[PDB]
Amino acid sequence: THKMAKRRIKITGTGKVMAFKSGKRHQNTGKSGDEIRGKGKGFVLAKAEWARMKLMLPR
Amino acid sequence: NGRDSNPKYLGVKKFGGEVVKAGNILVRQRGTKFKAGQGVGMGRDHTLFALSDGKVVFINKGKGARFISIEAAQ
C-alpha cells in the first residue's frame, strides 16, 4: 500500500512493526499528563502479521 | 435497563505465599479493603502494589482491618 509508509508499521531489524501514540494528537486536549507528551513508539503481535503486506519490500 | 455492561475488574491480583516482583499489583480495590504493610505502596485508586521484590503474605486483623505485606526472599 502507499499509505502505511508515512504512518506506523515501521519495519525493524527483527522485522517487528512500529506502533504509535494514538492517545490524542491534535484535537480534544487540555486534559492530563506526561501521558499527553507522548508521540512515541510501540508494537503488537497479531496485526504484525498482515501489516507489512502493505509496504512489503520498501520497509 | 440494564445499561452497564462493563466489568471494571477488581479482585486480588497477587495472593498470599506468592513470589512477587517490584512494581507488581497485589490488589485492585474500591476503598481500602485492606491497607498496605511494609513493601507496599498504594496508588490513587488504592490498588496496593509492590515497592520491593519478595514473598507477599497476608495479615488478617480483627475483622475489617486487613493488610498485605512483602517479606524478604534472598
Binding site: 499509505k3 508515512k6 504512518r7 506506523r8 508499521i9 504509535f20 501514540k21 494514538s22 496485526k47 | -
Partner: protein, 92 residues
C-alpha cells in the same frame, strides 16, 4: 478501514536523499592481502553499488596500516585508521 490502520496517527515526511554504502573496518583490515583500496580496486573489492557515495565505518579492531579513498567516513573510524597508522581521504 472500519478499523486499525487508519486510526493510526501519522504525517511524518519522505525525502530520503543521499545514503551511503557501508564499508566496514573489518573488511579492509584484518583479513585479505591489504589490496590497498583507494578509488577503483574497491569496485572489485566485492563492495559494489555506485549511484551512491561510499562511507567507511568502524567495526573490526586490529592493527594494519592502510589508506582509502571514500566519500565520507565516521569520526571514530578516522580515529582508528590513523591510530593503527594510515590515511583516509575526502574529495576536494
Amino acid at each position: 478501514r472500519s478499523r486499525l490502520i487508519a486510526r493510526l496517527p501519522k504525517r511524518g515526511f519522505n525525502n530520503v536523499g543521499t545514503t551511503y554504502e557501508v564499508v566496514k573496518l573489518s573488511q579492509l583490515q584484518d583479513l585479505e592481502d591489504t589490496t590497498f583500496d583507494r578509488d577503483t580496486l574497491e569496485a572489485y573489492r566485492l563492495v559494489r553499488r555506485k549511484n551512491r557515495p561510499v562511507k567507511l565505518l568502524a567495526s573490526g579492531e586490529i592493527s594494519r596500516a592502510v589508506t582509502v579513498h571514500v566519500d565520507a567516513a565516521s569520526a571514530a573510524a578516522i580515529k582508528a585508521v590513523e591510530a593503527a597508522g594510515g590515511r583516509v581521504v575526502l574529495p576536494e
